[PDB]
Paper text:
Gaucher disease (GD) is the most common lysosomal storage disorder which is caused by inherited deficiencies in β‐glucocerebrosidase (glucosylceramidase, GCase, GBA, EC 3.2.1.45). GBA is primarily responsible for catalyzing the degradation of GlcCer by hydrolytic cleavage of the β‐glucose moiety from the aglycone to yield free ceramide and glucose. This is achieved with retention of β‐anomeric stereochemistry of the released glucose unit through a Koshland double displacement mechanism using Glu340 as the catalytic nucleophile and Glu235 as the catalytic acid‐base.
Therefore, to probe whether this holds true from a mechanistic inhibition point of view, a crystal structure rhGBA in complex with cyclophellitol aziridine 2 was obtained at 1.70 Å resolution to enable a detailed comparison with cyclophellitol epoxide 1. The electron density of the resulting co‐crystal structure unambiguously shows that 2 reacts with the enzymatic nucleophile of GBA (Glu340) through the aziridine warhead to form a covalent trans‐diaxial ring opened complex which is essentially identical to reacted cyclophellitol epoxide 1. Indeed, 2 forms a covalent complex in the 4C1 chair conformation with a covalent bond length of 1.46 Å to Glu340. The only notable difference between the complex of 2 and 1 lies in their hydrogen bonding networks, where a hydrogen bond is formed between the O6‐hydroxyl of 2 and Asn396, and the hydrogen bond to Tyr313 is lost, likely due to the “downwards” displacement of Tyr313 in complex with 2. The flexibility of Tyr313 has been reported previously and the “downwards” conformation observed in complex with 2 appears to preclude hydrogen bonding with the ring‐opened aziridine. Instead, the aziridine warhead forms a hydrogen bond to a nearby water molecule in the active site. Overall, this co‐crystal structure demonstrates the almost identical binding mode of cyclophellitol epoxides and aziridines, which supports their interchangeable use in the development of ABPs for GBA.
Author numbering: 1 to 497
Amino acid sequence: ARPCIPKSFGYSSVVCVCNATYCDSFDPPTFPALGTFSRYESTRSGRRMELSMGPIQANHTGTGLLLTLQPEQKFQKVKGFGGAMTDAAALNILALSPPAQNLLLKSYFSEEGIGYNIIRVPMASCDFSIRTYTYADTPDDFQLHNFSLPEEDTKLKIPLIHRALQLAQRPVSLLASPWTSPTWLKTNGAVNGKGSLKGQPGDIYHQTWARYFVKFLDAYAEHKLQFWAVTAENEPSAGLLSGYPFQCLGFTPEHQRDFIARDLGPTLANSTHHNVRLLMLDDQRLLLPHWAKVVLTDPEAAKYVHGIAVHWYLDFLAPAKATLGETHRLFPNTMLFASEACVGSKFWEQSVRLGSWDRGMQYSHSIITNLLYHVVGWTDWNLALNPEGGPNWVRNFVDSPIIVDITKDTFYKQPMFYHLGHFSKFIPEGSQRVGLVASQKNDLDAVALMHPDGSAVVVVLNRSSKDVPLTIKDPAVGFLETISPGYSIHTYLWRRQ
Ligand SMILES: *[C@@H]1O[C@H](CO)[C@@H](O[C@@H]2O[C@H](CO)[C@@H](O[C@@H]3O[C@H](CO[C@H]4O[C@H](CO)[C@@H](O)[C@H](O)[C@@H]4O)[C@@H](O)[C@H](O)[C@@H]3O)[C@H](O)[C@H]2NC(C)=O)[C@H](O)[C@H]1NC(C)=O
Ligand SMILES: *[C@@H]1O[C@H](CO)[C@@H](O)[C@H](O)[C@H]1NC(C)=O
Ligand SMILES: *[C@H]1[C@H]([NH3+])[C@H](CO)[C@@H](O)[C@H](O)[C@H]1O
Ligand code: NA
């Protein structure tokens, strides 16, 4: 293993500095012996997923905080964790020297790094692009004879996705989402602004747009890439808004319902891509449960919908119980999945705050809350950005867990990288959330899961300044005596047999 090289930029914590010859990494992962636990600790004071071990003891006395594992009490199974391969992320990554590129990709995708198993792939251009394009810009090509992948896919995204899959030990799931259709399919004839597909579901415009998904998956399959899932549209609500500044395509929930039922569902179902999952919504969770009721109460739409994708941007309006909780109660067999998050998109937020602990805590707080309300996965936005938070053709700059400094052939791993890795690295696909009961009221955020192999994982986040001693009881194994430092995040792992 190789430790964090810390650097301060005057914010609350440090970044870890990597370059062509050096990056912080782990040793090969294992469980310690039965009766021992592993702790990984990150702190605002500068610890970065530091590994320690302790004994699991037969007995416990005290009136301190006890968190009792409920291994019998089972909730959702995890799909996974990852980020987005936008044009901006791909340009930032490929601007590094080849050896620095490989250290960045290992940081995300390998067991020497944090074990990402999800990549979100935009279907052509979005705001995190430098060129505005679709795959079918030749007008009135309803046949899609002129559908093609440009160099943004064939030279940048696709080769990087192959290199990520080559570095991974866990199967990586690709997720595709479109921002805009070709402008000749749209009411407003522009990639942006208020506008929907022309006509109505079941017509030539909607059939063409559904066939465009199949053409996309056909083109990526020619490059030996297969998708786990697509979303029905990135942020369909955005295309309902006057002047929306970048690539969008407006659907009401009724329009999405009818488009899925008539066009996208049947077109995917009758293609070689029939196993590819379809996720609906791909938008702010305040739209639940209303969007889920509109789409999923129509059985002809419901039969094609695997899952509901959510974005975090208005989570402050949208209590998890009233949205995620209510949606799970009404549609328990339709998985909830978090498909886009980043800090820096509010007009008052600075784009990039190198070393921000607050932004790290925003990530881990969101992931825990999502996991506590049945969500099966969590997906970052841009995998890498430049120090301005770009490039972005409408200057909608944001933050990213990795910031590339091409003049120094350097990249910085921010607190958000480690906060996400406290989950991604230690919660493999198939992990099942289990109960975790507190003996008393407390300021911690915590979640417990069981690996498919039966081992235990617990993540504890302390967003307070105060150290909290605590005990974790696993009824079948014993007690972990520990302490959650102020402004810390821990992951605990142990064999149960
Ligand atoms: C890529 O990043 C690498 C990590 O920063 C760069 O390597 C570093 O280069 C600097 C400047 O030559 C070295 O700094 C000197 O450090 C020694 C202390 O050395 C040792 O102790 C440190 C821990 O404090 C440990 O990390 C090392 O392994 C050594 O045992 C001081 O005495 C000097 O005054 C001066 O500060 C770093 O030691 C060196 N680190 C490593 C791990 O090699 C590398 O140059 C960068 N590459 C490019 C192409 O830019
Ligand atoms: C579109 O595809 C057709 C059929 O292969 C081709 O002959 C035509 O020139 C293409 N059009 C453009 C404008 O690229
Ligand atoms: C999600 C989100 N609004 C971010 C940041 O604003 C944007 O860059 C993506 O296009 C969007 O889908
Ligand atoms: Na901003």
